[PDB]
Amino acid sequence: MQIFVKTLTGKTITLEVEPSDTIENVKAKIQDKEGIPPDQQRLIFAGKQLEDGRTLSDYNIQKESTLHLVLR
């Protein structure tokens, strides 16, 4: 399932994920692709911060959904 992760300046990171992926799994994919430590990532979907141990399922994230990445 393709999703988009937009950085604060509006850069798009396109990811391939599964609905059963945890947020922590998504952070590790961002680490692999971008070199950013998971512990520095905040992922946001529709204005809310996402919890590391919860799956994409718990947020109804769907094909082409857009998340936002803010570095802490």
């Binding site: 937009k6 604060l8 300046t9 509006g10 905040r42 946001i44 529709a46 204005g47 911060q49 936002h68 803010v70 570095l71 802490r72």
Partner: protein
């Protein structure tokens, strides 16, 4: 602080896109607090 009227709208828009539900005025106030460091403003508002 830097006057609201001089803050580039692109900085406000960046914050808005992440902080769905937040008004411009809250974002403007935070940007003024953080010397227009939009990353710090958005972190502050997330926490």
């Amino acid at each position: 602080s830097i006057p609201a009227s001089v803050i580039p709208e692109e900085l406000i828009s960046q914050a808005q896109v992440v902080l769905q539900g937040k008004s411009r005025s809250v974002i403007i106030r935070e940007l003024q607090r953080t010397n227009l460091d939009v990353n710090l403003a958005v972190n502050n508002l997330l926490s």
